[PDB]
Amino acid sequence: AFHTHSGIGVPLRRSNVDTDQIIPAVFLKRVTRTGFEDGLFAGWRSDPAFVLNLSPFDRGSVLVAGPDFGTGSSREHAVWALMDYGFRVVISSRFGDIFRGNAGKAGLLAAEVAQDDVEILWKLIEQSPGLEITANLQDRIITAATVVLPFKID
C-alpha cells in the first residue's frame, strides 16, 4: 500500500539488471535471521567503487536504474531483497514484467520514467550525492531539486 516516499537517491547506471544480479541464487539457501540485505547486488558490492559502497548512497532508499531493470522471470526474493536493504522506490525506463507485478504486491514502487528523465535524475544525484528523491503516487510525479518528472505504474 505505497503512497509517498522521500529518500536518498542512488544512481545505478546498469542496464538489463537481472534477478540473479539483484539477488544471487546462493542467498536463497544461506542461513539468515534478518533478510537478504547482505545479498542485494552482492556480486558488485565487493568492489569499493560500487555505488552502494559510496556514502551517502549506502543509506539510499530510491534506486535510479538503467533500462530493463529486473528482467529474468523474477523471484519474489529480488523485490524482497531490495526492500530488506531499505529501498522503497525503484526508477527505470522499463521493468521486467514479473518483477513489476511482484514489486506492486510487496509495496515496492516500480516507477516507469522516460530514459531522458532518468538521465536528468542521474546527473542531479551524481552532482549532489545525498540529494533526496520523492515519489508521489497520487499525482504520479518524481521530484528532486527543482525538477518534477512524470512516471507510470502501468
UniProtKB/Swiss-Prot annotation:
EC number in record: 4.2.1.33
The family this protein is said to belong to: Belongs to the LeuD family. LeuD type 1 subfamily.
CC per GO annotation: 3-isopropylmalate dehydratase complex
Pathway entry: Amino-acid biosynthesis; L-leucine biosynthesis; L-leucine from 3-methyl-2-oxobutanoate: step 2/4
Protein name: 3-isopropylmalate dehydratase small subunit
GO process annotations (BP): L-leucine biosynthetic process
Subunit structure: Heterodimer of LeuC and LeuD.
GO molecular function annotations of the record: 3-isopropylmalate dehydratase activity
Lineage of source species: Bacteria, Bacillati, Actinomycetota, Actinomycetes, Mycobacteriales
Catalytic activity entry: (2R,3S)-3-isopropylmalate = (2S)-2-isopropylmalate
Function: Catalyzes the isomerization between 2-isopropylmalate and 3-isopropylmalate, via the formation of 2-isopropylmaleate.
Full-protein interval shown: 3 to 156 of 198
UniProt keyword annotations, A-Z: Amino-acid biosynthesis, Branched-chain amino acid biosynthesis, Leucine biosynthesis, Lyase
Tree of life domain: Bacteria
